[PDB]
Amino acid sequence: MNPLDLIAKRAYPYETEKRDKTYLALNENPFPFPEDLVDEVFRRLNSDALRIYYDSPDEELIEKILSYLDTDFLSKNNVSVGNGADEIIYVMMLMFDRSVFFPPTYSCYRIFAKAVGAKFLEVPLTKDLRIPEVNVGEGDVVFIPNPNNPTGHVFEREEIERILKTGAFVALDEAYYEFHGESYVDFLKKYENLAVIRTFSKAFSLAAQRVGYVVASEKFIDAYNRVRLPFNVSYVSQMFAKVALDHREIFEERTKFIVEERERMKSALREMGYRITDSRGNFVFVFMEKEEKERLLEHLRTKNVAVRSFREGVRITIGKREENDMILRELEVF
């Protein structure tokens, strides 16, 4: 009884979001999952398959993932899935002795670390958003989203490479890979102490279905597979990811619109005089002085607009054109 309250008080309280009319605070894709693809999924659905325990990493889903990665060195043994990239990170924290990340970073790193009671360390990035000096080695997992959350800034190659050389296991969280070009998947050829985490959540408009995947060494994937829940991804969720990848041209078009919308907003913000990051994610970040930031949030709240607030300022997710314009119009006049 008493120790359970001790469990609480150690982790952040569970809360749910109350979405405003124009929600741009969770990096969700602006467009719904394509309706004809939902119908495709409905049609490929074998009602008899619902009653069975369905191989979470589906054999054909791995194939599609491989296909998508389009490398010449990967095999099914280098890939696995997660109930969202969230679970991959979560279980990864169960696997290593200590988790290491650098704020500003994906806020769930801290939450999940405290949730599972894992030992972790937060070393802040330089004022230049560069990876600080740190003492890590085999035993630690270093979580590096890249593009970074919520800055969306892209780290330099020697930066990851440095951590990589320390023998520490790097978990390159490529949650925003799709909205940026590069990917360190190829690095899997030189380093074994690395894992690339992806999701269907941002570019495939499937955040509600929870599908993440990991590309890494056979030894890691095997380890991961022994630690994760056996059936972590539903038959229907996998079906959504497979259909999704069968029509990637569709989402390539949406991603292009998102990026073209990101740069448009980034340009407009500079013109207005705001300090912003060189975000390669599906969002933009604005540096603001607390007091002027708070003033901006109150104004936006008055207009049913929700963005993500941060110590450094605000993170704005890219939405539909009329939402992006709205953000610009309210920022202009303020």
Ligand X SMILES: Cc1ncc(COP(=O)(O)O)c(CN[C@@H](COP(=O)(O)O)Cc2c[nH]cn2)c1O
Ligand Y SMILES: Cc1ncc(COP(=O)(O)O)c(CNC(COP(=O)(O)O)Cc2c[nH]cn2)c1O
Minimum Å distance from CB 18 to ligand Y?
Answer: 17
| 319 belongs to the binding site for ligand Y (CB under 6 A) | no
Q: Which is nearer to a second copy, 71 or 225 (CB)?
A: 225
What is the footprint of ligand X within residues 129-188 (CB under 6 A)?
145, 149, 173, 175
CA distance 168 to 71: 25
Q: Which two tokens stand for residue 226?
A: 């022994």
At 323, which amino acid appears?
E
- For position 322 contacting a second copy by CB under 8 A, the verdict is no
- Cβ-based neighbours of 121, under 8 Å, separated by 6 or more: 98, 99, 100, 134
Taking Cα atoms as reference points, which of 204, 228, 218 lies closest to residue 87? Answer: 228
- Asked if 142 and 114 count as a contact pair (C-beta separation under 8 A), the reply is no
Per CB under 8 A, contacts with a second copy among 174-203 are 192-193, 201
Q: Is 280 in the site for ligand Y (CB under 6 A)?
A: no
Decide which of a second copy, ligand Y, ligand X, none touches 155; Cβ closer than 5 to 8 Å per partner kind: none
By CB under 6 A, is residue 207 in contact with ligand X? yes
Burial class of residue 153, CB neighbours in 10 A (0-12, 13-18, 19+): buried
Which of ligand X, ligand Y, a second copy, none lies near 4, with the C-beta cut-off 5 to 8 A by kind?
a second copy
Vertex 15 angle, CA 10 and 118, to 5° = 30
First to last CA, the chain: 51
Nearer to ligand Y, 202 or 266 (CB): 202
Segment contacting ligand Y (CB under 6 A): 106-114, 133-141, 215-223, 286-294?
Answer: 106-114
- Residues 12-71 close enough to bind a second copy by CB under 8 A: 12-14, 16-17, 19, 23, 26, 28-35, 38-39, 42, 45-55
27 forms part of the interface with ligand Y (CB under 6 A): yes
Min CB(213)–ligand X separation in Å: 9
Q: What's 240-282 look like in SS3?
A: HHHHHHHCHHHHHHHHHHHHHHHHHHHHHHHHHCCEECCCCCC
Six-digit token pair at 294?
């708070």
Using the rule CB under 6 A, give the single segment among 68-76, 132-140, 142-150, 246-254 that binds ligand Y: 142-150
Contact 76, 98 (CB under 8 A): no
Residue identified by tokens 């069968």 is: 246
Q: Work out whether 5 is an interface residue with a second copy (CB under 8 A).
A: yes
Residue nearest to ligand X (CB): 84
- Among all chains, which residue has been given the structure tokens 């892209």? 154
Rounded-to-integer distance, Cα 87 and Cα 99, Å: 15
| Residue nearer to a second copy on the CB measure, 140 or 174 | 140
- On whether the CB atoms of residues 212 and 199 are closer than 8 A, the answer is yes
245 binds ligand Y (CB under 6 A): no
User: What does the binding site for ligand X look like in residue numbers (CB under 6 A)?
Assistant: 26-27, 53, 84-86, 106-108, 145, 149, 173, 175, 199, 201, 207, 212, 230, 308
Residues at the contact surface with ligand Y, assessed by CB under 6 A: 26-27, 53, 84-86, 106-108, 145, 149-150, 173, 175, 199, 201, 207, 212, 230-231, 308
